[PDB]
């Protein structure tokens, strides 16, 4: 029985966070490190949606234009100032 | 004053020697794959090589 990829809902708007930048907290809770204009890292809890590609679709908690703080998990403890790179 | 310097004197284990080599350790964040780490190395390497 051949592999059948069957097209589906084709989500109109998907929050796709590189599964790099996706760090759950608390237990099983996606914590995105996206740093706002203050450039003081603030990890904003969310729930990554089903895993896809290398990234997480996340149904909630994040918005468009959010700069994901993805790497730098050492130089960034929460609240610290940060200079973005994308 | 003999007793004066004996105490002011910071003590060590042993003199460290430059041995012709050393090591640099690489740890990434959690859940991170080797490719991530790997890129770090050529960065590491490229520092050394260059």
Curated annotation (Swiss-Prot), chain A:
Source domain of life: Bacteria
The keyword Transmembrane is assigned to this record: no
Assembly description: Monomeric in solution. Homotrimeric; interacts independently with AcrB and TolC as well as AcrZ. Part of the AcrA-AcrB-TolC efflux pump.
Protein name as catalogued: Multidrug efflux pump subunit AcrA
Function: AcrA-AcrB-AcrZ-TolC is a drug efflux protein complex with broad substrate specificity that uses the proton motive force to export substrates. This subunit may act as an adapter protein that links AcrB and TolC stably together.
Keyword annotations: Antibiotic resistance, Cell inner membrane, Cell membrane, Coiled coil, Lipoprotein, Membrane, Palmitate, Signal, Transport
GO biological process: bile acid and bile salt transport; response to antibiotic; response to toxic substance
Location (main, coarse): membrane
Taxonomic source organism: Escherichia coli O157:H7
GO cellular component terms, semicolon-separated: plasma membrane
GO MF annotations, alphabetized: transmembrane transporter activity
Transmembrane segments: none
SS bond partners: none
UniProt record similarity statement: Belongs to the membrane fusion protein (MFP) (TC 8.A.1) family.
Localization, UniProt: Cell inner membrane
Curated annotation (Swiss-Prot), chain B:
Disruption phenotype: Loss of susceptibility to contact-dependent growth inhibition (CDI); inhibiting cells still contact the target.
Induction context: Positively regulated by MarA, Rob and SoxS transcriptional regulators (at protein level).
Origin superkingdom: Bacteria
Localization, UniProt: Cell inner membrane
Main function: AcrA-AcrB-AcrZ-TolC is a drug efflux protein complex with broad substrate specificity that uses the proton motive force to export substrates. (Microbial infection) Involved in contact-dependent growth inhibition (CDI), acts downstream of BamA, the receptor for CDI. Its role in CDI is independent of the AcrA-AcrB-TolC efflux pump complex.
Assembly, per entry: Homotrimer, with large domains that extend into the periplasm, interacts with AcrA and TolC. AcrA may be required to stably link this protein and TolC. Interacts with AcrZ. Part of the AcrA-AcrB-AcrZ-TolC efflux pump.
Similarity remark: Belongs to the resistance-nodulation-cell division (RND) (TC 2.A.6) family.
Protein name: Multidrug efflux pump subunit AcrB
Species this chain originates from: Escherichia coli (strain K12)
Lineage, uppermost ranks: Bacteria, Pseudomonadati, Pseudomonadota, Gammaproteobacteria, Enterobacterales
Name of the coding gene: acrB
Full-length numbering of the shown residues: 551 to 600 of 1049
């Amino acid at each position: 029985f051949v592999r059948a990829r069957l097209e589906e809902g084709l989500n109109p708007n998907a929050i796709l966070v590189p599964q790099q930048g996706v760090t759950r907290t608390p237990r099983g809770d996606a914590t995105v490190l996206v740093v706002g204009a203050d450039d003081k890292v603030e990890t904003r809890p969310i729930v990554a949606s089903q895993a896809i590609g290398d990234k997480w679709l996340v149904t909630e908690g994040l918005k468009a234009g959010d700069r994901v703080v993805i790497s730098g998990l050492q130089k960034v403890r929460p609240g610290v100032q940060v200079k973005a790179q994308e | 004053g003999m007793a004066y310097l004996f105490v002011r004197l910071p003590s060590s284990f042993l003199p460290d020697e430059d041995q012709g080599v050393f090591m640099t350790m690489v740890q990434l964040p959690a859940g991170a794959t080797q490719e991530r780490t790997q890129k770090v190395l050529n960065e590491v390497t490229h520092y050394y090589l260059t």
